[PDB]
Every structure is written in structure tokens, then in C-alpha cells.
Amino acid sequence: AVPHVALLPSSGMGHLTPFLRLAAALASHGCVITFITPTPVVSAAEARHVEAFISSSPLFRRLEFPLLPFSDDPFFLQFERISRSARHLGPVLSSVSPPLSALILDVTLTSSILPIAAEISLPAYILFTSSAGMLSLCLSYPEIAASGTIKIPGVAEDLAPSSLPQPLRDPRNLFTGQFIENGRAMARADGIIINTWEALEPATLAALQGSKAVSGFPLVIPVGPLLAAADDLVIPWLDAQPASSVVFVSFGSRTALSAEQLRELAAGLESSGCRFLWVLELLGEGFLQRVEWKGKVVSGWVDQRAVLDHPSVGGFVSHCGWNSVTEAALGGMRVLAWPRHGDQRINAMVVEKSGLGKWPSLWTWEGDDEIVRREEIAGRVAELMASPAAAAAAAKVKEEAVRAATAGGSSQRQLEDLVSRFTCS
Amino acid sequence: AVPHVALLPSSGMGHLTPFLRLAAALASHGCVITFITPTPVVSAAEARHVEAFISSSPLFRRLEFPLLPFDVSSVVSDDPFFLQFERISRSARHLGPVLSSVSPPLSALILDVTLTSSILPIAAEISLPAYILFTSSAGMLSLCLSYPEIAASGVTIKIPGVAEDLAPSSLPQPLRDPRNLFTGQFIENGRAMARADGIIINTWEALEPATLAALQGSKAVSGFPLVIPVGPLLADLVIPWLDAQPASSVVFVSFGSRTALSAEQLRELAAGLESSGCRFLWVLELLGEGFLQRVEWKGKVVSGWVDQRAVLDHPSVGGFVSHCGWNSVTEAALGGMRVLAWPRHGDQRINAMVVEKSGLGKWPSLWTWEGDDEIVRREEIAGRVAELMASPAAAAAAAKVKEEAVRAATAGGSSQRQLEDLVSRFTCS
Numbered sequence: 001a002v003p004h005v006a007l008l009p010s011s012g013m014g015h016l017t018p019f020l021r022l023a024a025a026l027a028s029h030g031c032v033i034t035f036i037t038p039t040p041v042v043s044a045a046e047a048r049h050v051e052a053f054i055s056s057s058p059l060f061r062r063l064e065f066p067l068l069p070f071s072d073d074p075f076f077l078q079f080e081r082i083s084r085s086a087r088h089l090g091p092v093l094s095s096v097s098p099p100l101s102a103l104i105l106d107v108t109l110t111s112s113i114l115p116i117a118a119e120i121s122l123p124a125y126i127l128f129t130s131s132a133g134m135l136s137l138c139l140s141y142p143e144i145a146a147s148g149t150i151k152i153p154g155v156a157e158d159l160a161p162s163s164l165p166q167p168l169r170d171p172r173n174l175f176t177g178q179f180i181e182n183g184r185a186m187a188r189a190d191g192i193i194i195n196t197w198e199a200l201e202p203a204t205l206a207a208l209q210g211s212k213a214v215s216g217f218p219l220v221i222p223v224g225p226l227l228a229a230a231d232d233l234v235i236p237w238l239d240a241q242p243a244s245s246v247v248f249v250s251f252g253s254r255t256a257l258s259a260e261q262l263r264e265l266a267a268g269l270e271s272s273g274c275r276f277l278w279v280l281e282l283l284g285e286g287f288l289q290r291v292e293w294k295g296k297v298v299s300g301w302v303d304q305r306a307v308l309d310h311p312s313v314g315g316f317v318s319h320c321g322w323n324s325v326t327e328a329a330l331g332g333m334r335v336l337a338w339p340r341h342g343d344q345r346i347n348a349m350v351v352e353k354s355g356l357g358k359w360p361s362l363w364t365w366e367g368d369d370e371i372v373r374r375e376e377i378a379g380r381v382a383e384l385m386a387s388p389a390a391a392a393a394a395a396k397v398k399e400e401a402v403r404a405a406t407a408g409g410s411s412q413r414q415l416e417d418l419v420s421r422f423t424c425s
Numbered sequence: 426a427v428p429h430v431a432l433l434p435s436s437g438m439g440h441l442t443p444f445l446r447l448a449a450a451l452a453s454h455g456c457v458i459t460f461i462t463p464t465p466v467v468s469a470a471e472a473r474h475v476e477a478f479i480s481s482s483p484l485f486r487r488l489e490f491p492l493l494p495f496d497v498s499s500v501v502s503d504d505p506f507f508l509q510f511e512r513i514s515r516s517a518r519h520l521g522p523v524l525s526s527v528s529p530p531l532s533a534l535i536l537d538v539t540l541t542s543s544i545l546p547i548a549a550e551i552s553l554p555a556y557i558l559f560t561s562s563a564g565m566l567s568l569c570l571s572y573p574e575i576a577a578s579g580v581t582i583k584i585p586g587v588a589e590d591l592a593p594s595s596l597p598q599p600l601r602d603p604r605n606l607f608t609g610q611f612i613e614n615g616r617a618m619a620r621a622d623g624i625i626i627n628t629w630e631a632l633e634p635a636t637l638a639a640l641q642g643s644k645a646v647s648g649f650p651l652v653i654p655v656g657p658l659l660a661d662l663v664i665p666w667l668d669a670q671p672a673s674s675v676v677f678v679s680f681g682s683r684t685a686l687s688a689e690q691l692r693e694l695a696a697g698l699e700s701s702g703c704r705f706l707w708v709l710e711l712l713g714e715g716f717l718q719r720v721e722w723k724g725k726v727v728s729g730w731v732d733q734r735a736v737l738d739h740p741s742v743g744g745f746v747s748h749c750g751w752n753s754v755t756e757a758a759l760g761g762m763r764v765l766a767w768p769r770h771g772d773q774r775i776n777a778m779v780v781e782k783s784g785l786g787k788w789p790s791l792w793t794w795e796g797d798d799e800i801v802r803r804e805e806i807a808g809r810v811a812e813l814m815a816s817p818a819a820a821a822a823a824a825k826v827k828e829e830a831v832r833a834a835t836a837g838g839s840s841q842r843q844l845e846d847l848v849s850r851f852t853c854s
């Protein structure tokens with residue numbers, strides 16, 4: 001028979017892409033998928049992606065949940081309303097037919113929905129969007145806050161305080177309290193699902209392997225990597241460009257770069273001496289006309305997977321969002337790591353240890369006052385684009401990543417084995 | 426009369442080498458240097474090095490102050506580093522008479538930072554100008570100068586030149602415990618350094634523009650800038666083997682005078698160096714049995730003291746793996762050899778940031794310290810070492826470092842001018 005799995009995502013492309021990709025893989029291994037999407041949607045633009053994906057096949061169905069909305073922080077308001085309906089969701093889950101084999105929920109909503117799932121005796125699995133290092137920080141942070149130090153079992157004997165997400169720096173914070181809850185809450189979950197593989201984070205996972213879920217099984221389940229217009233002016237341009245000669249710089253869904261900092265990144269690319277593709281009223285009037293021959297910059301949404309797999313692009317300047325890292329790993333693009341906020345610094349550490357790319361540690365976060373000079377920016381880009389051994393190291397990540405993805409690999413085995421937990425007798 | 430300067434260096438080749446190089450530079454610009462060397466010598470080997478230096482010329486001189494006998498009941502904690510410091514520190518009071526009696530009278534006294542707390546009061550009594558020579562980098566200097574304020578604060582380190590939020594891991598491992606004699610000794614020296622008439626460093630504006638700019642601001646010297654940068658001070662089986670090797674092909678790996686690398690770690694550097702597949706001259710018991718035979722064509726590993734300056738100037742070497750001792754960092758900067766920064770202890774982690782910011786070398790932050798003991802695996806050593814040699818942009822960056830460092834060192838350069846000005850201070854009307 002065919003198991004039935006409900007997916008409860010959270011707002012934001014960074015959380016949304018993995019869920020779609022995780023849903024796609026579960027359908028490929030026979031499961032039938034029902035997305036729980038609460039209404040009204042935070043973002044019309046993100047809603048289009050879910051609609052088109054669900055529209056494509058009868059294996060996926062959409063369930064609309066009324067938000068039932070009633071510090072006044074802007075992002076938190078959406079989550080509060082998203083999390084308020086937590087109690088109400090319980091009856092709706094039981095009503096769904098055919099009976100769900102299991103529920104898979106976003107980390108952010110882990111604290112809110114885990115009791116509901118436990119109330120109705122529904123197995124609850126958490127999808128972790130981030131790296132295993134970030135997960136390792138999350139799981140052990142409640143213990144750390146009591147007696148802190150900052151030794152994260154997965155990747156740090158003493159993590160520098162800058163590497164912690166910028167909100168987490170002050171303990172008497174609203175963010176800190178929720179963070180401690182999620183970490184504590186995740187241990188109680190039936191399973192945790194991450195988009196990492198053993199080759200990419202052997203150290204963090206091996207430490208993580210010891211952690212044990214309540215239900216007689218390892219808490220953490222790695223199924224990664226998962227594989228699944230504005231580009232119209234881009235793809236033709238890229239094809240003209242020589243093989244592996246174009247720097248690609250993108251910060252993902254949220255790119256809060258200040259104008260002072262912006263001018264420098266722009267100056268660095270011009271001073272880089274290599275072609276660049278940049279995605280975001282020019283600050284320099286003739287900058288665009290002057291640089292048209294060397295590189296193209298587009299303000300719209302683009303097609304990162306096509307760009308990363310494009311032959312002409314040779315390097316990736318990144319903010320080290322976990323989804324973009326995995327996509328860069330698959331591409332084998334050497335990555336220069338400019339982590340912007342949150343878990344992005346820890347992700348940068350993963351990039352360097354893996355050999356996927358190099359991280360200028362002394363470079364600043366969004367909170368930091370100090371700007372990054374263009375001359376410094378130009379050096380690392382030119383260096384990254386000209387280092388053959390860096391390219392070769394990136395190609396090993398790709399091979400290893402594909403190996404885990406390909407059939408028989410450690411990751412596909414874990415997804416096959418996870419599915420069986422649903423096909424119970 | 427020709428200016429007469431008194432040098433009171435602390436023990437250790439890393440501290441001794443700048444003094445000697447500064448002494449030669451000062452002598453070159455018309456100075457007679459008198460070395461205050463205590464008896465009994467800490468090290469015969471260092472003492473022989475100094476004696477050979479004094480023999481070089483009539484301008485250099487040797488004067489010995491016998492260390493006062495220790496009081497056994499008084500000694501605290503039984504530590505060899507501190508006991509040696511304590512005997513030299515204890516003779517501070519005795520030192521003033523000897524200084525005044527010198528013939529001809531000394532224009533100024535220039536002393537090691539470590540002994541500066543003990544000796545600075547002596548100088549004020551005899552009205553002798555005291556300058557401290559700072560063996561380390563400007564960034565490190567910034568930490569010493571502001572560490573006392575930071576300690577009585579804190580939420581964020583924020584060393585003025587080094588960073589906004591310096592990581593605790595980057596701080597010297599002794600400093601991590603605040604209630605320590607070392608942490609207190611560190612705090613005293615920093616306070617003392619403001620009082621001093623001047624602070625000399627082995628740096629130049631080109632190398633550390635931001636950190637030096639901030640220091641220009643402190644100007645704690647009465648009526649003058651406190652910081653005087655005169656850097657870069659400039660003054661067997663291995664070479665023959667080097668000459669054979671092809672141009673810019675050899676990885677030089679050396680951790681200075683003190684290189685405590687654990688046995689488990691030692692194996693990894695060998696495997697990593699072997700695996701990288703590029704040539705390597707490794708300076709430092711058969712930890713590897715067939716390792717030397719397998720890599721005999723590729724590299725030379727020797728245990729003796731070696732002419733590092735010749736190595737770094739050699740055309741066949743292409744990359745340098747170091748512990749980022751300021752003396753080693755500055756030597757490489759003159760050579761323009763790209764560096765792979767593996768800081769081991771003390772101020773070396775701060776030095777690594779200067780190597781990465783300069784473009785002289787790349788620093789792998791995640792690499793462990795002697796304090797923490799998670800080893801660096803050979804897979805990472807091989808990749809990082811090989812990539813450094815493979816990377817042409819890294820060579821260009823180091824080449825640019827050399828040019829500016831040469832510029833400062835040559836006539837009309839920032840430092841050369843600054844050294845000239847300092848000699849004038851010693852010779853007034």
C-alpha cells in the first residue's frame with residue numbers, strides 16, 4: 001500500500017524549496033503527499049511555487065488552513081498567527097483521509113505543533129533546512145546556555161561568538177527563549193530530517209549519530225542532497241562567455257546589503273578582472289554601461305540551479321544559505337563565502353572544511369559596522385577564479401554529493417529506510 | 426658626542442633577533458649600542474649568538490649585570506618561565522646605578538616589553554629616556570595597550586586595530602583565565618607601555634595601515650606619538666638541496682624556535698605533506714618508518730637550526746607554511762613567499778589575521794591551537810598546502826607585499842624615515 005505523508009512548511013523560499021524537493025523525493029519512493037498550507041499566505045510569490053508544484057501531479061494535494069489571526073515584531077507576527085492556530089490544527093489532522101502515515105513539520109513550528117501530533121498519536125518528523133552544524137548547535141544550545149565555553153559537539157571546541165546568529169548574542173532576548181525551546185523540542189520529535197550527506201559533514205554527523213530519538217532510533221536522518229523570465233536575458237549571455245570564466249554572486253531570497261557596502265561589491269567585480277553575473281537605479285550612473293562587456297547584473301529572481309550547472313560559470317560568491325550551498329556542492333562551483341546572517345557563518349565553516357570553497361573569516365556580518373573594501377573583495381574573487389586546485393577540490397564535493405544521492409548511497413538508503421517507517425504492518 | 430644606546434633584551438630568539446637587527450640598524454645610522462646582558466646567561470646558545478654579534482664591530486658593546494640570588498621562601502608557583510623572569514625582574518632596582526655610571530653616558534635605554542614593568546621606574550629616577558621594542562605585530566600591540574580597559578569592562582573585545590569582536594580563541598591561551606599571574610603580568614605591562622617615552626615595532630604603514638592609524642591616535646608618549654614603526658628590520662645540507670630544486674617549487678614548513686607539535690599531529694603534517702605531492706623542506710625519533718624513503722625524491726626534512734632568511738630568499742622555494750611568528754611573518758613579507766598560516770600559540774593567531782588581510786597568505790581559521798587538542802587531519806593539510814602552491818593569485822598578492830615592504834625599508838620609506846627621526850631624538854643640542 002501507499003503511505004500518506006503531510007508536509008507543513010514555513011514562510012520563505014529557503015524553507016520552501018527543500019520541502020518541495022523533499023516532497024518530490026517521497027513521491028518518487030511511492031508516498032502520497034498532502035501539503036498543509038495555512039491561509040492567508042504570507043507571500044503571493046512563494047504561493048505560486050507551491051501551487052505549480054502541487055498542480056503538476058495528483059500525488060500531491062493542498063490543504064488550506066485558516067490562519068485564524070487575532071512586541072509586534074513583523075516576521076514574528078506571521079509566525080505567531082501561524083503558530084496560534086497550532087491547537088486548532090489538531091482536529092483537522094485527524095480528519096484527513098487516507099490516514100496519514102506521518103507528519104513532517106518545519107523546525108520553526110516544531111515547538112508549536114509537536115504537542116498536537118503527540119496528542120493524536122501521530123508520528124512527527126522535523127525537516128531541518130540548515131546544515132548539520134547548525135542542527136548540532138540547536139540541539140545542544142539549551143545545555144550550553146546554563147553553564148557557558150560555546151563548545152558545539154558537531155564542529156567547534158570553542159565557537160567564536162560572532163559565528164552565533166546575530167539575535168542569539170544577547171541572552172535576555174525574545175529570540176533566545178524561542179531558540180532554547182526549539183532545541184529542547186526537537187529532541188522529543190520522532191525524527192529529524194536534514195539536507196546533508198556524510199561526505200559533506202562527517203564530523204558534525206558522527207557527533208550527531210550518537211544523539212538518540214525517544215522512539216528507539218537515531219534522532220537525525222540525512223536524506224541530502226535533494227535535487228529538483230529574469231534568466232531570459234541571462235542564459236543567452238552566459239552561453240557567449242568562456243568556460244568557467246564567470247563569477248556568480250547571489251545572496252538568495254533575502255539580500256540585505258547596505259548601499260555603502262553595495263558600491264564596494266560593485267567596484268570589486270569591476271576590479272576583479274573576471275566576468276561576473278550578479279543578481280539583486282544604479283548607484284554609479286555609467287557603471288552599467290561601462291561594465292556591460294565584462295558582466296551582467298539583474299535585479300530579478302533567476303535560475304540558480306541552471307547557473308550553477310552552466311559551463312561558463314566558474315565560481316560562486318555566496319551568502320552560504322544552506323540550500324545554495326548544497327546546490328553549489330552539486331554544481332561543483334568553488335564558493336567564496338560571504339555569510340550574511342543567521343546560520344550562514346556556521347555554513348561558511350562547512351564550505352571551508354569541505355574544500356568547496358574558501359571563507360574570509362575576518363569579513364563582517366550585517367550587524368557589524370565595518371564595510372568590506374573593494375580592493376579586498378577584488379583580490380579574493382580574482383584568487384578564487386584563478387585557483388585550479390580550488391576547482392579540483394570543489395569537483396570532489398560534487399562527486400561525493402552525487403555518490404550519496406545516487407542509488408545505493410548513504411542518503412538514498414536513509415530515504416528508503418525512512419519510508420519503511422511509514423509502511424508499517 | 427656620538428649617541429650611546431642601551432639594549433636590555435629578554436630571553437628567546439624571537440625576542441632577541443629584533444634587538445640585534447635594531448642594534449645593527451641603529452649602529453648603521455651612527456650609533457654605539459651597549460647590550461645589557463645578565464649573568465648567568467639564560468641560554469649558552471643564545472649567548473654565543475650575541476657574543477658573535479658584539480665581535481662584528483667596535484660600535485657594539487657588552488655589559489653584564491649579575492642577577493641577584495633568589496630568595497627560596499619568596500618564590501611562587503615553581504614555574505620555569507616565571508622564575509627566570511623573576512630573577513631578571515628582581516635585579517631591576519639594582520640596575521639604575523649601573524646605567525648612570527656607564528661611560529659615555531647613554532642617550533636612551535631601550536628595553537624588552539616583558540621587563541618594561543620592572544625597569545620603567547628605574548629610568549624615570551635617573552631621567553633616562555626609555556623606549557620599548559615590541560617584538561610582535563601592531564595588532565598584537567593594540568591588544569596589549571587596550572587589554573586593561575577591556576578586562577575592566579568585557580561584552581566585546583573590539584581591539585581598535587585588530588577587529589570589532591575579536592574571538593576568545595584568538596586570544597593567547599594563558600589570557601583565557603583572567604585570575605592568573607600571567608594575565609596580571611600582561612595587564613601590568615600594557616599599562617606600563619603608555620608611560621614609556623616610545624614604543625618601537627617591527628611594522629610598516631603598508632602592512633598594517635588600519636591598526637597603525639588607530640595607534641597614531643593613542644600618542645600616549647608625552648608630547649609625541651607613542652608608536653614608532655621602524656620595520657622591517659633587515660640583517661649546511663639544506664641550501665645545496667634547495668639549489669637542486671626547481672624554481673618556486675618547494676614548500677617551506679617551519680614553526681620557529683619553539684614548535685611544540687604533538688606526536689599525533691606530527692604524523693598528520695607528514696602524511697599531508699607527503700600526500701600534497703609538491704616539494705617540501707620541513708624543519709624541526711622515527712615517527713614515520715618508510716615516510717622518508719617514499720618522499721626522498723620530493724622533500725628534505727631536517728631537525729637542526731637553519732638559515733631561514735636564506736631559505737625565504739631562495740628562488741626554488743614557492744610557499745611557506747608557518748606559525749606566524751612576527752619575525753617569520755615579516756621575513757616572508759620581504760621574501761614575498763605566500764604563507765599558509767597555522768598559528769600555534771600566544772600572539773600567533775592575531776599575526777595570522779595580518780597575513781590574511783595583507784594578502785601575504787591564507788589563514789585556515791578552523792585549524793586548532795596547542796591549547797585545544799583536536800588534530801588537523803592530513804586530508805586538510807594536503808589540500809590547503811597544495812592549493813597554496815597551485816594558486817598564482819596568492820603569489821601576486823605576496824609579490825605586492827614585498828614591493829611595499831621594500832619601499833618602506835628603502836631610503837625615503839616610511840620606516841627608514843621613522844628610524845632616521847628616532848636617531849635624531851637621541852642626538853639633541
Ligand SMILES: O=c1ccn([C@@H]2O[C@H](COP(=O)(O)OP(=O)(O)O)[C@@H](O)[C@H]2O)c(=O)[nH]1
Pocket residue numbers: 012013014015017250251252253254279300301302303304305320321322323324325327
Ligand atoms: O534569483 C534566485 C534566487 C534564489 N533561488 C533559490 O534560492 C534557494 C535557497 O535559498 P538559500 O537557503 O540558499 O538563501 P535564503 O533563502 O535562506 O536567504 C536556492 O535553492 C535557489 O535555487 C533561485 O532559484 N533564483
Ligand SMILES: O=c1ccn([C@@H]2O[C@H](COP(=O)(O)OP(=O)(O)O)[C@@H](O)[C@H]2O)c(=O)[nH]1
Pocket residue numbers: 438439440442679680681682683708729730731732733734748749750751752753754756
Ligand atoms: O630553523 C630556524 C628557525 C627560526 N629561525 C629564525 O628565528 C626567527 C624568529 O622566529 P619567530 O619569532 O617568527 O617564531 P618564534 O621563535 O618566536 O616562535 C626567524 O627570524 C628565523 O630567522 C631560524 O633562523 N632558523
